[PDB]
């Protein structure tokens, strides 16, 4: 079975590439500008830097 006519087709291929460059401050989310809560938080160490 041999083709005698053809066609040129166009297809769309969608690919995600990036995401929203989120960033988080622990102190606001967890404590909310409260120094005492931050002081208690310091006992946890390097979770937030991580």
């Amino acid at each position: 079975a041999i083709p005698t006519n053809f066609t040129i087709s166009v297809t769309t291929e969608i690919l995600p590439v990036s995401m929203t460059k989120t960033s988080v401050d622990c102190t606001m989310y967890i404590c909310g500008d409260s120094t005492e809560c931050s002081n208690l938080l310091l006992q946890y160490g390097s979770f937030c830097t991580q």
Binding site: S23, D25, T27, M28, D33, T35
Partner: protein
């Protein structure tokens, strides 16, 4: 070399503000602590205070 999203220590609060309702009435502590008669336990008294 580079850019760093540093933690947020720059500003710290300085003073306090206290706001309360404008009531000068003294509460009737006497009428409950300094009472001629207390209710018996089965019929304990319930006093609204306001």
């Amino acid at each position: 070399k580079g850019i760093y999203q540093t933690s947020n220590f720059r500003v710290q609060p300085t003073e306090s503000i206290v706001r309360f309702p404008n009531i000068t009435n003294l509460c009737p502590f006497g009428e409950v602590f300094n009472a001629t008669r207390f209710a018996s336990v089965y019929a304990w008294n319930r006093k609204r205070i306001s």
